[PDB]
């Protein structure tokens, strides 16, 4: 029946703890860095950085780090988005001290030696290739590239022309301007609060202050079309949406679940979705449709993602688009909204159920203000979404300037100006 403790230190570092009884402890360091802070001169730096988590440090060599973590049996991982980065370690309660020391060294004492960086470059290409096997990866990065001018467009993977051209100087420059105390948050689960304070005191004698800041992500209604020999076309067309934290963001979340954000029944037909039940009666069964919602600090994106056949690519899109228009025209019943809300609550509480996702959630909202937001309050806000708000969101999407990113045969896919 324990609760969490929060403290904000003079430097700016945020600490968090939630004493549990699981025999496994997990600690995470969340940094407000990402690809949104790079520029055209240093593109591809973050991708290389997230692969350097096992390089030699001032206080520990690469050999020591790898062997030590393996002998203890713990795990080290790095998770990166376009706005945040996170280091995470998991181990047993009795070995927490050593792993915290390694995490201190890696995030605080990086060397970035020349020959090591040169060797890592091959890895980058392999890492980018395995991720691009899934077509959605390429499609969505192009979508960002076709939706913004300056920020939130920088790819999450190193461009091919920058491989082998990343230097230790860029790594050091990025670390010193972004890995700052007032930009970090340390979260612990199996550890007690006072020991976190102790290790934090070791974190409060480095870096410090604030860091270089980026610029507002301007919106450009672009299109990027790619041609290949695949039999299936992946298309995504999107419009701007206000984000984050506003009740309008909640309205968009409810809206996407009205339109069938995802599947519930294994091998089901998704009879409760307005999109799948329109495409199904329009063309053959092989297809897929869903709503797409992305939230970022200064902007948000809401749209529709579809996978269909090359010949049927056109009609499919039309049908999906039509469905949204009916919602914006005032056609709605207060019985699917309740179902949509239930879907949202279930997804949230069931996603946070795992300890790993719970740690990620706490770290994510610890940076905006540091005040934890219990799920009960989240549910309260969700239940407060009216009906006119959802219609308002639909009208904004229809009237908004659209973007698009298609990848496939694109022989019958429509252009953005024909939608």
């Amino acid at each position: 029946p324990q609760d969490l403790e929060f403290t904000k230190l003079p430097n700016g570092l945020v600490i968090a703890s939630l004493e549990n009884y699981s025999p496994v402890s997990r600690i995470g360091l969340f940094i407000k860095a990402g690809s949104r802070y790079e520029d055209f001169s240093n593109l591809g730096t973050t991708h290389l950085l997230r692969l350097t988590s096992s390089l030699t440090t001032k206080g520990a060599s690469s050999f020591k780090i790898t062997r030590g973590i393996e002998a203890v049996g713990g795990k080290l991982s790095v998770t990166a988005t376009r706005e945040n980065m996170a280091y995470t370690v998991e181990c047993l309660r009795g070995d927490v001290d050593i792993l915290m020391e390694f995490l201190l060294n890696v995030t605080t004492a990086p060397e970035f030696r020349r020959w090591e960086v040169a060797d890592l470059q091959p890895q980058l290409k392999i890492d980018k290739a395995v991720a691009f096997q899934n077509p959605q990866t390429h499609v969505i990065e192009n979508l960002h590239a076709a939706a913004y001018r300056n920020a939130l467009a920088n790819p999450l993977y190193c461009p091919d022309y920058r491989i082998g051209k990343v230097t230790s100087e860029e790594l050091h420059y990025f670390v010193q301007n972004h890995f700052t105390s007032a930009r970090m948050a340390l979260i612990g689960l199996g550890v007690s609060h006072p020991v976190l304070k102790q290790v934090a005191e070791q974190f409060l004698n480095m870096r410090g202050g604030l860091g270089l800041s980026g610029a507002k992500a301007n919106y450009r209604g672009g299109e990027i079309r790619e041609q290949n020999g695949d039999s299936l076309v992946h298309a995504a067309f999107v419009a701007e949406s206000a984000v984050a934290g506003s009740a309008e963001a909640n309205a968009f979340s409810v809206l996407q679940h009205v339109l069938g954000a995802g599947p519930h029944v294994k091998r089901g037909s998704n009879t409760t979705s307005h999109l799948h039940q329109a495409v199904a009666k329009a063309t053959q069964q092989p297809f897929d449709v869903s709503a797409f919602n992305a939230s970022y600090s200064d902007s948000g994106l809401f749209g529709i993602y579809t996978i269909s056949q090359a010949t049927a690519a056109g009609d499919v899109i039309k049908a999906a688009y039509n469905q949204v228009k009916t919602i914006a025209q005032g056609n709605l019943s207060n019985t699917d909204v309740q179902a949509a809300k239930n879907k949202l609550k279930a997804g949230y509480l069931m996603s946070v159920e795992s300890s790993e996702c719970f740690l990620e959630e706490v770290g994510s909202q610890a940076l905006v203000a540091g005040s934890y937001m219990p799920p009960s309050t989240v549910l309260q806000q969700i239940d407060s979404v009216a009906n006119a708000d959802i219609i308002n969101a639909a009208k904004k999407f229809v009237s908004g300037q659209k973007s698009m990113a298609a990848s496939g045969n694109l022989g019958h896919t429509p252009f953005v100006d024909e939608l």
């Binding site: 096992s54 979340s253 909202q365």
Partner: protein
């Protein structure tokens, strides 16, 4: 309520020194498997999946 997990959407790679890169959100290919979709990824410079770390 701000995380990608809480708002399904763009991929969040979890590449690690000791585990694979299986990650992401709002990946609408698993629902398409049931409807006719013989297409499956080829094994060109590919890795295993399910990241069997906690066996």
């Amino acid at each position: 309520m701000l995380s990608v997990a809480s708002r399904s959407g763009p991929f969040a790679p979890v590449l690690s020194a000791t585990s694979r890169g299986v990650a992401g959100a709002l990946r609408p290919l698993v629902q398409a498997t049931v409807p006719a979709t013989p297409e499956q990824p080829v094994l060109d410079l590919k890795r295993p999946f399910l990241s069997r770390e906690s066996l």
